[PDB]
Amino acid sequence: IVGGYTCGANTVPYQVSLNSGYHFCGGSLINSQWVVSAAHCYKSGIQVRLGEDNINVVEGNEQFISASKSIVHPSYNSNTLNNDIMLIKLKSAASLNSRVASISLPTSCASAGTQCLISGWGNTKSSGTSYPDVLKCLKAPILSDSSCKSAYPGQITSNMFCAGYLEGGKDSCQGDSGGPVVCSGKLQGIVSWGSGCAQKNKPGVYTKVCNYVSWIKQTIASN
Numbered sequence: 308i309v310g311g312y313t314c315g316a317n318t319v320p321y322q323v324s325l326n327s328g329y330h331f332c333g334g335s336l337i338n339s340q341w342v343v344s345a346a347h348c349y350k351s352g353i354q355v356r357l358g359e360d361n362i363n364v365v366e367g368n369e370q371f372i373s374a375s376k377s378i379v380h381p382s383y384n385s386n387t388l389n390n391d392i393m394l395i396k397l398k399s400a401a402s403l404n405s406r407v408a409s410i411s412l413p414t415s416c417a418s419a420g421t422q423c424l425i426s427g428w429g430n431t432k433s434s435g436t437s438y439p440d441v442l443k444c445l446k447a448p449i450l451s452d453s454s455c456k457s458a459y460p461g462q463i464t465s466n467m468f469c470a471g472y473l474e475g476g477k478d479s480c481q482g483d484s485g486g487p488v489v490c491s492g493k494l495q496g497i498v499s500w501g502s503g504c505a506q507k508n509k510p511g512v513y514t515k516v517c518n519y520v521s522w523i524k525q526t527i528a529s530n
């Protein structure tokens with residue numbers, strides 16, 4: 308997250324870290340046994356880390372649970388990043404509390420102008436590299452589809468939305484991939500792609516979760 312603020316320990320209780328020896332992506336807990344993330348975060352041997360703030364220090368509220376199965380969207384395209392969503396089932400159910408909690412799925416898509424919360428442990432600089440150890444947060448609005456398509460001509464599908472600031476300076480960044488965009492208490496987005504980080508006229512692009520609720524619900528119900 309570039310241009311954000313320190314969230315505060317366990318103030319984003321649905322935020323997860325995906326760990327393969329090191330943090331490599333974010334995700335969101337959507338019930339006691341399932342996490343949603345970006346398909347471009349797919350790899351084997353994932354451990355899901357819940358209840359994290361400082362990812363390098365054991366602070367006492369963590370739950371570390373191995374994945375038992377991962378399911379990349381059937382129509383994910385790695386070249387265009389269309390349908391950039393995956394589901395991860397935990398080997399055992401998480402213990403839900405005030406600091407580890409699920410985030411609701413949307414019943415309706417969010418409109419442009421809605422303010423959302425984006426969070427992650429990704430790079431905090433637009434030029435250079437500095438990775439924080441504690442969770443960072445950013446409040447950002449959903450942009451109009453017209454502004455989104457004008458920023459990325461020929462690249463924005465119906466399954467994507469832009470959020471952030473056309474002026475630049477505030478955005479998600481590398482290592483935030485997979486993480487949540489929460490608006491009015493519902494998961495509306497997944498951190499997906501962009502051109503660099505926090506550049507003028509290049510906002511972040513997010514997977515539009517409301518399009519996938521049916522697939523999520525049916526997949527969970529049979530796996």
Ligand SMILES: NC(=[NH2+])N1CCCCC1
Nearest residue numbers: 479480481500501504511
């Ligand atoms: N919002 C961005 N600029 N992103 C998404 C996360 C990866 C780097 C590009």
Ligand SMILES: [Ca+2]
Nearest residue numbers: 361364365366
């Ligand atoms: Ca920790």
